[PDB]
Protein backbone atom coordinates (compact mmCIF):
# COMPACT_ATOMS: atom_id res chain seq x y z
CA UNK A 1 0.00 0.00 0.00
CA UNK A 2 1.12 3.42 -0.39
CA UNK A 3 1.75 5.51 2.54
CA UNK A 4 2.28 9.18 2.65
CA UNK A 5 6.07 10.16 3.26
CA UNK A 6 6.16 11.23 7.40
CA UNK A 7 10.22 11.69 8.05
CA UNK A 8 10.74 15.45 8.44
CA UNK A 9 11.52 16.36 12.47
CA UNK A 10 9.39 18.59 12.91
CA UNK A 11 6.80 16.59 10.83
CA UNK A 12 4.74 19.76 10.43
CA UNK A 13 2.78 22.22 12.31
CA UNK A 14 -0.13 21.59 14.21
CA UNK A 15 -2.25 24.55 14.85
CA UNK A 16 -5.02 24.53 17.81
CA UNK A 17 -7.39 27.01 17.57
CA UNK A 18 -8.82 26.99 21.02
CA UNK A 19 -12.08 29.45 21.39
CA UNK A 20 -13.21 29.63 25.21
CA UNK A 21 -14.25 32.85 26.24
CA UNK A 22 -18.10 33.88 24.31
CA UNK A 23 -18.32 37.42 26.26
CA UNK A 24 -18.59 39.17 22.80
CA UNK A 25 -20.66 36.84 21.21
CA UNK A 26 -23.17 36.69 24.30
CA UNK A 27 -22.73 40.88 23.89
CA UNK A 28 -22.82 41.15 19.96
CA UNK A 29 -24.97 38.67 18.58
CA UNK A 30 -29.02 38.75 19.65
CA UNK A 31 -29.58 35.26 19.01
CA UNK A 32 -26.55 33.74 20.87
CA UNK A 33 -27.27 35.76 23.99
CA UNK A 34 -27.01 32.91 26.02
CA UNK A 35 -23.95 31.44 24.42
CA UNK A 36 -21.43 29.74 27.08
CA UNK A 37 -17.78 29.91 27.75
CA UNK A 38 -16.76 26.52 26.69
CA UNK A 39 -14.88 25.85 30.09
CA UNK A 40 -12.64 22.60 30.26
CA UNK A 41 -11.85 23.33 26.21
CA UNK A 42 -7.74 23.61 27.91
CA UNK A 43 -7.81 20.07 28.35
CA UNK A 44 -8.33 19.56 24.99
CA UNK A 45 -5.73 21.94 23.78
CA UNK A 46 -3.49 20.24 26.57
CA UNK A 47 -4.31 16.60 25.11
CA UNK A 48 -3.82 17.51 21.53
CA UNK A 49 -0.51 19.22 22.64
CA UNK A 50 0.95 16.19 24.05
CA UNK A 51 -0.53 14.09 21.85
CA UNK A 52 0.80 15.55 18.45
CA UNK A 53 4.45 16.73 20.16
CA UNK A 54 4.98 13.10 21.06
CA UNK A 55 4.36 12.53 17.07
CA UNK A 56 6.55 14.94 16.25
CA UNK A 57 5.04 17.96 15.12
CA UNK A 58 5.11 21.80 16.46
CA UNK A 59 2.00 23.50 18.33
CA UNK A 60 0.71 26.62 17.58
CA UNK A 61 -1.50 27.82 19.80
CA UNK A 62 -3.85 30.55 19.59
CA UNK A 63 -6.61 30.73 21.85
CA UNK A 64 -9.75 32.90 22.36
CA UNK A 65 -9.98 34.24 18.60
CA UNK A 66 -12.95 35.86 16.19
CA UNK A 67 -13.51 34.99 12.84
CA UNK A 68 -11.64 37.49 11.64
CA UNK A 69 -8.36 36.46 13.89
CA UNK A 70 -8.93 33.07 12.46
CA UNK A 71 -8.77 33.87 9.06
CA UNK A 72 -5.50 36.01 9.90
CA UNK A 73 -4.42 33.12 11.49
CA UNK A 74 -4.71 30.50 8.88
CA UNK A 75 -3.22 33.07 6.22
CA UNK A 76 -0.03 32.97 8.18
CA UNK A 77 -0.12 29.30 7.72
CA UNK A 78 -0.87 29.31 4.10
CA UNK A 79 1.73 31.39 3.23
CA UNK A 80 4.08 29.84 5.27
CA UNK A 81 6.69 27.61 3.93
CA UNK A 82 5.72 24.00 4.18
CA UNK A 83 8.71 22.57 2.02
CA UNK A 84 10.51 21.42 4.38
CA UNK A 85 7.83 19.85 6.28
CA UNK A 86 5.62 16.52 6.13
CA UNK A 87 2.02 17.17 7.07
CA UNK A 88 -0.13 20.40 8.57
CA UNK A 89 -2.86 19.88 11.08
CA UNK A 90 -5.30 22.23 12.34
CA UNK A 91 -7.16 21.91 15.29
CA UNK A 92 -10.10 23.93 16.01
CA UNK A 93 -12.24 23.82 19.47
CA UNK A 94 -15.04 26.04 19.18
CA UNK A 95 -18.85 26.47 19.20
CA UNK A 96 -20.47 25.73 16.11
CA UNK A 97 -23.61 25.17 13.78
CA UNK A 98 -24.62 23.34 10.77
CA UNK A 99 -21.52 23.35 8.54
CA UNK A 100 -20.07 26.61 10.54
CA UNK A 101 -17.98 27.04 13.82
CA UNK A 102 -18.03 30.50 15.48
CA UNK A 103 -15.18 32.69 16.15
CA UNK A 104 -15.48 34.17 19.69
CA UNK A 105 -17.22 37.16 18.41
CA UNK A 106 -20.42 35.15 17.30
CA UNK A 107 -19.25 35.25 13.74
CA UNK A 108 -19.67 32.19 11.56
CA UNK A 109 -16.60 30.64 9.54
CA UNK A 110 -17.98 28.27 7.22
CA UNK A 111 -15.93 25.07 7.91
CA UNK A 112 -15.05 24.94 4.13
CA UNK A 113 -13.62 27.96 4.19
CA UNK A 114 -11.11 27.16 6.76
CA UNK A 115 -9.78 24.23 4.95
CA UNK A 116 -10.38 25.39 1.34
CA UNK A 117 -7.25 27.97 2.68
CA UNK A 118 -4.96 25.01 2.12
CA UNK A 119 -5.75 24.02 -1.47
CA UNK A 120 -3.03 22.78 -2.99
CA UNK A 121 -3.23 26.15 -5.18
CA UNK A 122 -3.37 28.37 -2.15
CA UNK A 123 -0.54 26.37 -0.62
CA UNK A 124 1.88 24.75 -3.40
CA UNK A 125 4.66 23.59 -0.54
CA UNK A 126 1.57 21.45 1.05
CA UNK A 127 0.84 20.00 -2.77
CA UNK A 128 0.82 15.94 -2.35
CA UNK A 129 0.89 15.98 1.75
CA UNK A 130 -1.46 14.76 3.97
CA UNK A 131 -3.95 18.44 5.53
CA UNK A 132 -5.76 17.48 8.59
CA UNK A 133 -8.45 19.37 10.15
CA UNK A 134 -10.01 18.18 13.73
CA UNK A 135 -12.84 20.37 14.31
CA UNK A 136 -14.72 19.86 17.89
CA UNK A 137 -18.06 21.57 17.80
CA UNK A 138 -21.54 21.26 17.56
CA UNK A 139 -22.95 21.03 13.60
CA UNK A 140 -26.92 22.13 15.11
CA UNK A 141 -28.51 21.72 18.05
CA UNK A 142 -30.16 18.45 17.86
CA UNK A 143 -29.76 15.32 19.99
CA UNK A 144 -28.42 12.41 18.11
CA UNK A 145 -31.25 9.25 19.59
CA UNK A 146 -29.78 6.29 20.62
CA UNK A 147 -30.87 2.95 18.68
CA UNK A 148 -30.46 -0.37 20.32
CA UNK A 149 -28.09 -3.03 19.73
CA UNK A 150 -26.65 -6.46 21.01
CA UNK A 151 -23.30 -6.65 22.90
CA UNK A 152 -20.03 -7.43 21.12
CA UNK A 153 5.26 16.34 -14.54
CA UNK A 154 2.37 15.46 -13.25
CA UNK A 155 -1.31 16.32 -11.71
CA UNK A 156 -3.94 15.74 -9.43
CA UNK A 157 -6.55 17.41 -7.83
CA UNK A 158 -6.16 20.68 -6.02
CA UNK A 159 -8.58 19.45 -3.00
CA UNK A 160 -6.25 16.20 -2.52
CA UNK A 161 -4.89 14.90 0.43
CA UNK A 162 -7.30 16.48 3.41
CA UNK A 163 -9.06 14.69 6.28
CA UNK A 164 -11.76 16.47 8.09
CA UNK A 165 -12.25 14.86 11.66
CA UNK A 166 -15.62 16.39 12.60
CA UNK A 167 -16.61 15.63 16.18
CA UNK A 168 -20.41 15.32 15.08
CA UNK A 169 -22.74 14.40 12.33
CA UNK A 170 -24.61 17.41 10.91
CA UNK A 171 -27.10 18.83 12.66
CA UNK A 172 -26.21 17.10 15.84
CA UNK A 173 -24.65 18.78 19.54
CA UNK A 174 -21.20 17.24 20.20
CA UNK A 175 -20.48 16.99 24.12
CA UNK A 176 -18.09 19.17 26.36
CA UNK A 177 -17.20 17.96 29.70
CA UNK A 178 -15.86 21.15 31.92
CA UNK A 179 -14.11 18.87 34.22
CA UNK A 180 -12.38 16.57 31.26
CA UNK A 181 -12.41 17.81 27.28
CA UNK A 182 -14.92 16.69 24.82
CA UNK A 183 -15.98 13.08 24.18
CA UNK A 184 -14.28 13.22 20.77
CA UNK A 185 -10.99 14.98 21.51
CA UNK A 186 -9.99 13.30 24.30
CA UNK A 187 -11.19 10.10 22.54
CA UNK A 188 -9.00 10.88 19.32
CA UNK A 189 -5.72 11.60 21.43
CA UNK A 190 -6.18 8.43 23.50
CA UNK A 191 -6.67 6.29 20.45
CA UNK A 192 -3.89 8.36 18.32
CA UNK A 193 -1.14 7.94 21.31
CA UNK A 194 -1.94 3.90 21.84
CA UNK A 195 -2.11 3.27 18.08
CA UNK A 196 -0.12 5.08 16.21
CA UNK A 197 3.25 3.53 17.74
CA UNK A 198 1.78 0.21 16.42
CA UNK A 199 1.86 1.09 12.84
CA UNK A 200 -1.99 1.53 12.38
CA UNK A 201 -3.36 4.31 9.82
CA UNK A 202 -5.53 7.43 10.70
CA UNK A 203 -8.59 6.05 9.33
CA UNK A 204 -8.86 2.66 11.53
CA UNK A 205 -8.07 5.05 14.54
CA UNK A 206 -10.89 7.33 13.05
CA UNK A 207 -12.66 4.19 13.18
CA UNK A 208 -11.72 3.11 16.60
CA UNK A 209 -12.75 7.23 17.96
CA UNK A 210 -16.35 6.75 15.96
CA UNK A 211 -16.87 2.98 17.97
CA UNK A 212 -15.82 4.90 21.28
CA UNK A 213 -17.47 7.77 21.20
CA UNK A 214 -20.79 6.00 20.01
CA UNK A 215 -20.70 4.38 23.60
CA UNK A 216 -20.62 7.28 25.47
CA UNK A 217 -24.19 9.03 26.19
CA UNK A 218 -25.54 11.89 27.87
CA UNK A 219 -28.51 10.44 30.48
CA UNK A 220 -29.91 13.83 30.71
CA UNK A 221 -31.24 14.11 27.47
CA UNK A 222 -30.57 10.43 26.38
CA UNK A 223 -28.16 12.19 23.69
CA UNK A 224 -25.77 9.97 21.83
CA UNK A 225 -22.57 11.33 19.13
CA UNK A 226 -21.58 10.21 16.07
CA UNK A 227 -18.34 11.68 14.72
CA UNK A 228 -17.64 11.63 10.93
CA UNK A 229 -14.64 11.85 9.31
CA UNK A 230 -14.49 12.89 5.42
CA UNK A 231 -11.71 12.44 3.37
CA UNK A 232 -9.99 12.88 0.07
CA UNK A 233 -6.40 11.20 1.31
CA UNK A 234 -4.83 8.54 -1.82
CA UNK A 235 -2.53 7.26 0.68
CA UNK A 236 -2.51 5.66 3.99
CA UNK A 237 -1.81 8.15 6.53
CA UNK A 238 0.20 7.10 9.44
CA UNK A 239 2.26 9.30 12.36
CA UNK A 240 5.49 7.32 13.33
CA UNK A 241 6.86 8.01 16.46
CA UNK B 1 -22.42 23.77 32.51
CA UNK B 2 -22.29 19.75 32.81
CA UNK B 3 -22.63 19.45 29.37
CA UNK B 4 -22.18 20.83 24.77
CA UNK B 5 -20.53 23.06 21.94
Given at each position: ?31 L ?11 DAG ?13 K ?5 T ?6 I ?26 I ?24 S ?10 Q ?20 P ?12 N ?5 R ?14 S ?10 I ?13 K?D ?9 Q ?7 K???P? | ?D???
Amino acid sequence: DKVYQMKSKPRGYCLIINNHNFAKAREKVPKLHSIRDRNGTHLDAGALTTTFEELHFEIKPHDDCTVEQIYEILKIYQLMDHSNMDCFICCILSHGDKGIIYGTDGQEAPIYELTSQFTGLKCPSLAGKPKVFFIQACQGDNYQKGIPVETDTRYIPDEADFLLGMATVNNCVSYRNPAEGTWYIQSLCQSLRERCPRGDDILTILTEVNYEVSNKDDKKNMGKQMPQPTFTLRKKLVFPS
Amino acid sequence: XDXXX
